[PDB]
Design a protein around this ligand. Sequence first.
Ligand SMILES: Nc1ncnc2c1ncn2[C@@H]1O[C@H](COP(=O)(O)OP(=O)(O)NP(=O)(O)O)[C@@H](O)[C@H]1O
Ligand SMILES: Nc1ncnc2c1ncn2[C@@H]1O[C@H](COP(=O)(O)OP(=O)(O)NP(=O)(O)O)[C@@H](O)[C@H]1O
Ligand SMILES: C[C@H](c1ccc(CC(=O)N2CCN(c3ccc(C#N)nn3)CC2)cc1)C(F)(F)F
Ligand SMILES: C[C@H](c1ccc(CC(=O)N2CCN(c3ccc(C#N)nn3)CC2)cc1)C(F)(F)F
Ligand SMILES: [Mg+2]
Ligand SMILES: [Mg+2]
Lengths: 352, 352
Amino acid sequence: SPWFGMDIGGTLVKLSYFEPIDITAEEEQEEVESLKSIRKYLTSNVAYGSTGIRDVHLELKDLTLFGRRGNLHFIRFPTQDLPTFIQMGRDTVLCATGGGAYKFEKDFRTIGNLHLHKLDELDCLVKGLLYIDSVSFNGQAECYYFANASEPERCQKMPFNLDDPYPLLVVNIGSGVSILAVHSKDNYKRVTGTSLGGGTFLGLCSLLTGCESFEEALEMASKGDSTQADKLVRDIYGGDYERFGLPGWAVASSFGNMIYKEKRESVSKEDLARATLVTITNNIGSVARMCAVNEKINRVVFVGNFLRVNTLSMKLLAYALDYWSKGQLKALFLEHEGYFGAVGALLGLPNF
Amino acid sequence: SPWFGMDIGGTLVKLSYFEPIDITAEEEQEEVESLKSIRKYLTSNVAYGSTGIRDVHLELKDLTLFGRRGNLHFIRFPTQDLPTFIQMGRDTVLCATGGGAYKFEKDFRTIGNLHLHKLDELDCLVKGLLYIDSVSFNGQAECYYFANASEPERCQKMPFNLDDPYPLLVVNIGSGVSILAVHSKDNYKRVTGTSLGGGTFLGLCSLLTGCESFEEALEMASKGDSTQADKLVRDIYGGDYERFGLPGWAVASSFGNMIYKEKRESVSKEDLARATLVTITNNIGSVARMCAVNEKINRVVFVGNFLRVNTLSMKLLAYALDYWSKGQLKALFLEHEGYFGAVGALLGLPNF
Ligand SMILES: Nc1ncnc2c1ncn2[C@@H]1O[C@H](COP(=O)(O)OP(=O)(O)NP(=O)(O)O)[C@@H](O)[C@H]1O
Ligand SMILES: Nc1ncnc2c1ncn2[C@@H]1O[C@H](COP(=O)(O)OP(=O)(O)NP(=O)(O)O)[C@@H](O)[C@H]1O
Ligand SMILES: C[C@H](c1ccc(CC(=O)N2CCN(c3ccc(C#N)nn3)CC2)cc1)C(F)(F)F
Ligand SMILES: C[C@H](c1ccc(CC(=O)N2CCN(c3ccc(C#N)nn3)CC2)cc1)C(F)(F)F
Ligand SMILES: [Mg+2]
Ligand SMILES: [Mg+2]
């Protein structure tokens, strides 16, 4: 059978697929036609149907896995389209995680003789994260940070070594947010979570602006001015609130200037998109900061697809975590940030 | 001069006014006409102009303050209308707090010979809170909780003794949120804050529903179903997420079902109002929970006018804090919740 791992989230399905590249002449003969059709389909296309995408830039080349050499591919599509995926499959051992491994268990079993093995979504996340960092991103660092995140003329992506990664606070920004404390390879806990996550950004942005995609929401946000919607400290105090070290530019009330009808009539969709992004991102960083202080962990890594093609939120997190922590916490990011659960599921294959 | 304290917030001005009731015959003679006009105006009206309100039910009767007996009155109006207030004043020592004490300092000084004394908004909050609890609410408890907050057929308001109130976590829900740790009458700190406060509720609700007042937003929310907009754990898992004790009814992603166009087309304004209220209230409780755990404080008191005439948010806080704390934290509420800064400012009068 082909080697897959799948993470079925509330919004996106993530699939990790190992393509063997050491197939012998005899193995190619014994390779059944349906299986050759799937490998050729997956490796000769980068778009699958109307909504599946292979993230070619993330491919790990010439990886040794389970004693074979191959390429590790990263594929995503909306969970809304999982029925199409299963129907094509109906036209094999599947290790699957995320809530959808449970929700759609009966649907996967419509594939005759398919063996579904449900694995825990945060177990798989930790295992996949640690594995990908260990093997490297084709010899480059998997983990990075933004150096000098408070100075835009200096701020730049730089590699970060995770060779001894414990302890680590992992902030998984999906539909919602889960916060994990990782103390060892076998000692981790879910500290808490928040409901204000990527689904809040996308849902509120769609309601407020009429955008029809994540990418459109980000493009709108890139053009907006969140201070047209937000009430700042200087709007209330006339300046800094010196006594408690609050700068005048800090947001006192997200969307707080929208209590005034005339301001609601002048605000642009782009302003609202940017205010939504800033509101969600600052809340995530603040919750991460509080959890890091309580867990006594100073390295905070952010994962999940809220941050894919989202440099604005990444740089806001990098700046805000450093600023509000007075430099005590460091924001870390990973190149394969949305796919760790799917990789961790694939890594469960030998147990079955 | 009349005895006032004023808290000029980002949204509302709160005024505490001490009406002497022990005026002698000789004092009444020496009482200048403008001053009698103000006392009669304040005590014979409950609405002032088009936007000022006296909260008559909060009046403290026959209070002894600064060696005189009198009634303590509680009055509020929008900060947007402070120019009207100052203009009428132009037609005396003012102790003032909130950001507006700084922002509008020059405007108060247009009142000839007026002495403005700016006092810190969180100093005044702590002093006013401790004072009002100490004198009682006309012999009744100032502080209350919701007994059996998880069982609607049992849940009921009950008095709570704060005779030894330390330590205490104070959550001030105004335009934004400030979280205070109070260790003694002279030892308190601002732990942190969040930008997702009462102004976020009102501003987002106005954008999403077209409501034109706080009270209208609450009325809409009372009729709505937040689960039409929110994505729940059971929407992702099909049920509970047993491994981490997350019930299926918990919100996984606030507004997360609004990423689907057909759901945006079916959701009602009332549903959106309720989702906004639930989103903001749960975030406040969660941040309060994390701060209480870090500060090692088990009593959490919620103040500010986000909760005025807002039993929905109060009961949600009471239930959520108890539930997610596994009964380790208690949500507390105060009858005079919006006015403590104004009282604390009034209490600064003897220092000048
Ligand atoms: N193409 C896309 N379509 C939808 N959302 C996207 C897309 N790209 C990025 N996003 C964002 O990524 C979020 C989903 O991230 P992801 O980590 O895949 O969550 P999930 O696993 O599907 N949800 P969960 O069940 O809570 O773990 C969305 O809420 C968006 O903010
Ligand atoms: N009549 C009202 N008008 C406006 N907002 C109201 C009203 N009644 C209750 N509210 C709510 O109360 C909040 C303001 O509470 P309040 O404690 O008075 O804040 P503030 O002091 O004006 N702001 P801040 O400068 O941040 O401390 C608003 O954001 C609303 O959610
Ligand atoms: C005094 C009062 C008020 C001011 C400010 C705030 C908001 C606030 O205190 N903060 C601090 C924490 N902050 C973040 C952000 C990102 C990260 C990370 N990563 N961490 N913390 C958010 C804003 C509330 C009330 C008002 F009168 F001026 F309105
Ligand atoms: C697993 C993942 C997910 C589930 C749930 C959540 C949200 C979450 O974890 N919580 C816990 C803390 N919680 C509150 C609320 C109020 C108070 C008080 N007072 N305290 N805590 C908010 C919700 C995120 C992600 C998903 F796959 F199912 F999506
Ligand atoms: Mg996920
Ligand atoms: Mg205030």
